[PDB]
């Protein structure tokens with residue numbers, strides 16, 4: 134994912150390996166809802182889909 | 184554990200953390216360290232340093248005088264004022280040789296300044312010893328009183344309106360046989376008083392320094408002013424000088440000199456820097472030395488110019504020092520206190536004074552004339568700073584390798600009080616020889632460097648007038664933190680001045696962003712407290728709170744109201760430069776906008792342009808919108824002038840007929856009264872023509888104007 | 898002096914308001930100012946100042 138702060142005019146990128154344990158305040162309503170739904174599957178930065 | 188911040192200098196170098204060695208932020212609230220005893224000590228020590236000179240008797244004041252010039256060579260390291268004229272002349276000759284044409288161009292500029300200047304300039308000085316009333320008085324009032332006395336004594340050259348004319352008037356006065364002083368008794372009934380001063384009494388009064396450090400009378404302001412103009416002109420063209428530059432240029436000068444002396448040093452040359460102060464600057468600067476150097480400077484010049492420049496040192500060389508208020512005597516047996524004026528100190532027994540004061544009086548009695556001590560040698564502070572700087576720069580410039588004839592050579596700055604030498608030489612023996620030669624030459628010229636206050640370290644670090652240099656980093660603490668409180672002009676002026684000073688400190692004084700934000704917060708709190716303009720919402724129960732609350736309950740866009748009307752503060756590092764009324768003009772409510780800016784409000788006052796949107800502290804200028812909050816606060820409050828406000832009364836009623844008089848210096852050949860008369864006649868005629876005036880007013884105005892004409896003709 | 902350089906139970910400063918930060922440097926300045934204020938918003942010396 135890519136985050137940007139307009140106030141300080143800064144840009145940063147976060148990998149998927151750190152998406153399992155990270156705050157949900159950065160994301161919007163739909164994205165945070167999707168993260169909530171898919172949280173219990175991410176094993177070693179890789180979801181499980183049987 | 185014990186807190187001991189000095190240990191912090193084991194990690195943070197002293198220069199970096201120098202802010203911690205400056206205790207006060209502002210003026211300490213005691214202002215002590217002056218008195219009559221101090222003047223006695225100064226006179227005694229000045230005559231001590233020069234004691235070995237020749238003793239003479241002045242033919243006019245009859246006072247003894249001392250002449251250390253060309254005295255025997257000093258034999259010890261104690262401060263000596265036994266300067267040699269030949270040596271100072273040779274030093275000035277070399278200085279001219281290494282800077283050809285500097286003296287000449289300085290002389291031309293000084294001639295221009297002499298020609299164009301005006302009398303009223305002397306109303307821009309500090310507290311001045313009015314000889315007429317024999318006491319300290321303001322510069323403006325003192326000048327008015329001296330003009331009145333000269334007019335009553337048949338001296339009206341200054342009426343022309345030129346400073347040199349006032350100097351010629353003083354010339355006429357001091358050769359006068361007697362001076363008549365008139366005074367009024369302002370209650371109960373009013374009377375008159377006349378006093379007569381012989382030649383010697385007035386002469387002594389002219390050459391007096393009231394001590395409160397000391398301030399001379401209007402007699403000796405112009406000559407020192409012109410000599411200062413000359414010295415400033417010479418110094419502006421010198422690189423090694425330290426005046427009259429500001430804060431930003433000082434750093435550049437320091438960096439330039441240090442780089443020049445260090446880089447030019449080869450791999451086989453050793454360099455050193457001596458940060459130094461002068462033992463006693465103004466107590467060893469003989470006026471004769473300055474006269475000799477001015478004579479050399481003004482070689483091949485018009486005689487009038489030479490004499491105008493030479494009067495000041497001549498006047499100073501025979502000057503008198505006053506002894507202040509006097510002494511206080513207290514008796515415990517009857518708890519009885521009395522004041523003994525210094526005048527009778529000449530003829531009072533020596534049993535009421537302690538041992539130290541007894542010694543002071545015993546030493547100063549032979550030099551006491553008419554209650555004033557004759558101090559020929561030495562000088563006072565704040566008058567000949569620039570010429571002394573010129574002499575110091577001359578001796579420094581003497582260090583060029585060509586003059587020394589040997590390997591060692593030196594350079595550096597000089598700001599009169601302090602200095603910073605830099606010496607290059609092959610070996611430490613060379614450094615020692617160079618410093619010895621510099622010291623001996625400074626002694627010969629009559630300059631003593633404070634051996635205790637002066638220390639020498641390899642090049643790279645030093646100090647100079649509170650500017651600390653460390654391996655290229657210069658720290659400025661000459662003035663330290665300014666005053667962030669409300670200056671006290673009015674609401675808008677104080678707000679603008681505070682924001683502007685924060686901004687200027689950020690730009691120049693190296694202040695930080697967070698520091699600026701905190702300063703703004705403190706200033707806004709202080710402003711709100713001082714002017715009783717707390718937020719309309721908040722309850723603080725001041726006198727003004729109710730009306731602010733009503734206003735807040737009335738308006739709609741509460742974000743637009745001014746701080747002084749109960750509005751939020753909207754400043755930041757972003758918009759420190761924007762005047763308040765503009766910064767929130769868009770948000771202002773229509774009715775509040777109309778009322779606040781109604782130009783027919785009775786609370787707005789504007790003075791002459793020189794005092795409009797400008798404040799005197801040095802002076803600074805601020806930007807603000809002339810609103811209802813630009814009011815002016817109430818004023819608080821033996822005189823030669825019968826009516827102290829006659830001139831102010833006269834200038835007023837000129838602004839009425841001619842408003843432009845307030846803006847620009849009006850120019851005209853007609854006398855004033857005829858000017859008002861013509862303007863009034865024209866205005867009344869046109870007013871009648873319009874139809875807003877009837878016949879009776881026209882007849883009255885013309886009768887009055889005719890009567891004024893008859894009154895002025897006769 | 899040792900008792901002066903130590904903290905207290907309550908806050909002895911109520912510095913007034915400023916304009917909203919917009920510039921990035923304004924934000925850094927606000928951060929630094931708030932950190933310092935929290936550092937010395939309760940210190941004894943601040944009690945002395947207010948009193």
Ligand SMILES: [Mg+2]
Nearest residue numbers: 459460601602
């Ligand atoms: Mg020094």
